[PDB]
Amino acid sequence: EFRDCAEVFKSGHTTNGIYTLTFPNSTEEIKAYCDMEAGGGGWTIIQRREDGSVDFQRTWKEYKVGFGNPSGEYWLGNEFVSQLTNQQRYVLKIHLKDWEGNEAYSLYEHFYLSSEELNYRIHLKGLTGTAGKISSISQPGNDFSTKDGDNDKCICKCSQMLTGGWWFDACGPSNLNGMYYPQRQNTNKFNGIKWYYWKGSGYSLKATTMMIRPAD
């Protein structure tokens, strides 16, 4: 059994693909995708967009246990990530693709989610990368919100206004779990897949991937 893609890569399995991981402090398993070829490898994907259209306006429960497929677009799960990220220090790497064929990334030295009781609040430290000098995810990390779980800092329900579950502020500078818009419909959409500090205002990205890995 493996705790994440890092241990998987370190056991000799150096090839990309879906792997079966096990929850820590539990016997439950979970199917995640391991990116072993992207620089160094050992990456555990926790979310992906590219479009295999999965529908991201999911419930609190669904974002907690995961939805979609590891082979395509998916969420992996908040309960698992929270358990992993509290067992040891993880790094978070977000890879983005726009519709003009450009790519970029944001990287955090340390990332972890608080337990469900604290609404899986995100914690971020030390940003680097080509996807902005200022974190597109509001610092002083927010709680996680879903259509049926409003934990943002807005008098409004950010989740329903922009669609998707996310660490919304007063609907901060980003939402990787927003409505997918195809080419030639990806501009001027407060509704799309946004990472403000890279493409800007109403730009809706073509593909996104969130992955974690420890300091290996």
Does 154 appear as a known binding residue?
yes
Name the one range near Ca ion by CB under 5 A: 12-20, 52-60, 142-150, 164-172: 142-150
Q: Which of 201, 153, 156, 147 is nearest to 174 (CA)?
A: 201
Break the chain down into helix, strand, coil percent, rounded to 5. 15, 30, 55
Name the one range near Ca ion by CB under 5 A: 49-57, 148-156, 160-168, 192-200: 148-156
Place of tokens 């974002």: 63
Contacting residue, 87, 107, 150, 160, with Ca ion by CB under 5 A: 150
In which element (H, E) is residue 124 found? strand 122-129
Q: Is 152 in the site for Ca ion (CB under 5 A)?
A: yes
Instruction: Output the CA torsion 78→53→34→24 (10° steps).
Output: 20
Using the minimum distance from each CB to Ca ion, give the nearer residue, 4 or 143.
143
| Least spacing, CB of residue 145 vs Ca ion, in Å | 7
In which element (H, E) is residue 25 found? none
Using the minimum distance from each CB to Ca ion, give the nearer residue, 108 or 168.
168
Name the one range near Ca ion by CB under 5 A: 61-69, 146-154, 183-191, 202-210: 146-154
Does 171 appear as a known binding residue?
no
Size of the site for Ca ion (CB under 5 A): 3
Does 5 appear as a known binding residue?
no
Round to whole Å and give the CA distance between 158 and 168. Answer: 6
On whether the CB atoms of residues 48 and 74 are closer than 8 A, the answer is yes
Q: Is 38 in the site for Ca ion (CB under 5 A)?
A: no
Q: Is 169 in the site for Ca ion (CB under 5 A)?
A: no
Does 98 appear as a known binding residue?
no
Place of tokens 């409003």: 150
Residues with Cβ within 8 Å of residue 189, at least 6 apart in sequence: 179, 181, 202, 203, 204
Name the one range near Ca ion by CB under 5 A: 13-21, 41-49, 89-97, 151-159: 151-159
Query: Which residues make up each annotated binding site for Ca(2+)?
Result: 150, 152, 154, 156
Query: Which residues make up each annotated binding site?
Result: 150, 152, 154, 156
Give residues in contact with Ca ion (CB under 5 A). Answer: 150, 152, 154
